[PDB]
Design a protein around this ligand. Sequence first.
Ligand code: NDG
Ligand code: CL
Ligand code: CL
Ligand code: CL
Ligand code: CL
Ligand code: NA
Length: 129
Amino acid sequence: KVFGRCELAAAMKRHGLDNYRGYSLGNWVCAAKFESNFNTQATNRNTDGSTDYGILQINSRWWCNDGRTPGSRNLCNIPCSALLSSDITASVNCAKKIVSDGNGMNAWVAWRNRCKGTDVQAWIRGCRL
Ligand SMILES: CC(=O)N[C@@H]1[C@@H](O)[C@H](O)[C@@H](CO)O[C@@H]1O
Ligand SMILES: [Cl-]
Ligand SMILES: [Cl-]
Ligand SMILES: [Cl-]
Ligand SMILES: [Cl-]
Ligand code: NA
C-alpha cells in the first residue's frame, strides 16, 4: 500500500509515534518519505546481504528474520514480511525499539541525511490531526 502523506501521519499518530522519544510526527513522516516513498511494500537489498523492509526500511540484520541473513538478530521478534503489510502496526512497534537503542533516529540513514535539521513539520502541515 502506498500511503498518502496525511493518511500516514494519522496512522503514525494513532500508534503513538508523534513525539516518541522526543521526535515530533514530522520526523517520522519525513523518514518514511525518503526511506520507502510511503510504500509499505518497499524492499532494498544491502551490500552485506541483509535487506530493508517496509515503510521505514527496517533492517533484517538486527530487527527481523527473513531466513537469509546469516548470523543476524531478530530483536523485534517478527518475520520481515510482517513489515510489508498495509497495517503499519508491526513497523511502528519495531521502530519504537530501534529509536530507543541509544542513537535516536540516526539509525535511519535517510532521516539523518535528508530530514535531520530541516523543517520536518512541513510534512504534516495541511493534515487534519
Ligand atoms: C533502522 C534501519 O533498519 N535502517 C536501515 C539501515 O539498515 C541502513 O542504514 C540502510 C541500508 O540501506 O537503510 C535503513 O536506513
Ligand atoms: Cl512535526
Ligand atoms: Cl536469517
Ligand atoms: Cl495502519
Ligand atoms: Cl535522541
Ligand atoms: Na535477522
